[model samples]
Target: APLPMEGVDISPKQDEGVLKVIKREGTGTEMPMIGDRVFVHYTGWLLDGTKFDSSLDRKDKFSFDLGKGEVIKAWDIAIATMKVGEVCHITCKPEYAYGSAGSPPKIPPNATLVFEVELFEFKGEDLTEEEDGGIIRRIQTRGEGYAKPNEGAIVEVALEGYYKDKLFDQRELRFEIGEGENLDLPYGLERAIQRMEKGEHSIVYLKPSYAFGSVGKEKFQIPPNAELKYELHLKSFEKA
Candidate 1:
């Protein structure tokens, strides 16, 4: 079905089978290059103007890598046209958005979508001087321990297992270093201990795949591709 551009209309250009930019931004970074990760703040609405998702509500930032096979095609195209700090309204046809099999309960099949996005940042491999100035800086290290749980290793952890801000699993969950006896550590979680040392905590974010993927696991009602945030803290450490 063609897009229902009821109240919005912008003529786009065609370039080698790709939709060209209809409007240009004075300071916009080139639409995120393929494989670049974008940090965005967005609000999503249905064709009927019903809002379905809003990062503003959570007071949090959303991050994802473009063309990583984690999101819809329309997002890939729409985001590619934006620059850091540039905000744009995008309308996506079903074929480019969710296709015939849309996400249920929130998105209908073949439904058109409207999104307001603020591209906060885009990071690629190499860094230009100007780009380097805009990078977010983090110096804190969280979690620390040797591979084998010793007697007392301070474990810094960033937890995202909580649901709706309630302690569901645990973030940056710290135990006496080398104390795995009482910990039901997920396979990947133990790695956090290996990366950090005593008295260090790192801020870590977990995607659904890393924390709790599609299963919902009886502990969460998380959706597929959902992202989780955490701040790991290494409380104490004692060598075995």
Candidate 2:
């Protein structure tokens, strides 16, 4: 036990109900603020280190918006206090984790849980916002052509729609830019199509006002006034 302790009773105490311990210190004094999406790799287990769930096995870091109720209460608070490159360990009661039911089949009722979290990056504060609206675009793979699809041009695209950390829908679609009356596409999708060029790939984050809005889509059980996160790959497009 060479590590020096930081908070109450040898662990950093979080008023949010999780006992926190920083296993490794991070680089700076920066902490993630609300509305920043954070990338983290975490593994959780019971007090005995019996592994329950982990994103590391999946081979991709889990990302979620901070302060938006995207993760369990303990993680939301624990991760927020961490700086970039910090590794944090937490022991949280059921009330701060899966609650009274203890997540049923796996976690025992009222069990305490152990977690290891690494904060790799916290971002999304500098997205390019469209002047007239709440649409934010972050380009992942840029396009080859400068020209975008015209209003009536047909586009072939690979589309994935996400809510929080879940992929609600994903499919390859071919549709004219503005002609699908029964398209049921969110207004944000329509807005995104107009901005993408052939062979482009990007993620668009838009608010409900630019998306499903007051009457949300029923197909994916999307609730009213929800924000949309979409990944689009423009496979090909034909001129109007």
Candidate 3:
């Protein structure tokens, strides 16, 4: 059965052979940059209406760096132009899709593919420039609401500090945000936590400058200049 046309054609360039239709409008005018990590849900079909693949079935949104050639050309191009919450249908010519050699057992040679893609989320801004990789934070579990702790705020947190694979400390504690000194916590941990919302869990990397620095923690068996990783959970906080 022919796919009934349901939306206005909005292909960026008709000469490019990649056709796009906006089935649903989305909010915001901003799109992802080249290195931004993007997550999306998608379903694909052949021109003949044969189902091929879908991220919906996997129950996990596909994540990748946009415009990095990490995905099909059509995806890189189409998704780069999409805003969060956008749902678009794209039809890719073979050259922009799998090319002359198709994905075996799924797509055939010179096959055109159609996909309904929904952009969900993205993260990758210049979060840190100081000492480049001096402090890297990766969110493991997304938190609720939008409020983050402020300096001098009293925060309740659960954390595990580590030196490589070795666990140095694990505890649930409360402390004033800027007063991490009393707890012997690294300055970087406090900085990272301040950017997190309540109930968020993140893995943070700390370089020597952010960790123990030239003088390692003797009690924890950490060496001088030792790089550290932390499992940090911001449970809650109260403004001071």
Highest TM-score: give the candidate number.
Answer: 3
lDDT of 3 by residue, 1-240 (tens): 343454334345655457777767678888898777788999989999988898998856788878889999899888877888989889888878899998868899999899999998776523454637677767777667778898999999999998878899999989998899778898888888887888978888888988889998887899899999999999999976
Which 10-residue span in candidate 2 carries the lowest summed lDDT?
Answer: 8-17
lDDT digits (tens) for residues 146-236 of candidate 1:
3334446555455444444555566446566445434644322444444445554544444454545665445355555555544455555
Q: On TM-score, who's better, 1 or 2?
A: 2
Tell me the tens digit of each residue's lDDT in model 2 across 79-116. Answer: 88899999988888777788877765669888889889
Clashes of 2: 0
Model 1 residue 218 CA deviation in Å: 48
Off by over 4 Å in 3: 1-25, 57-60, 67-70, 100-106, 129-131, 237-240
Candidates' RMSD to native: 14.2, 9.8, 4.5
**What would the C-alpha RMSD of candidate 1 be, to one decimal place?**
14.2
lDDT of each: 0.55, 0.78, 0.82
How much RMSD separates candidate 2 from the native structure?
9.8
lDDT at 153, model 2: 85
Candidate 1 accuracy as TM-score: 0.45
Which is the better candidate, 1 or 3, if ranked by lDDT? 3
lDDT against true structure, model 1: 0.55
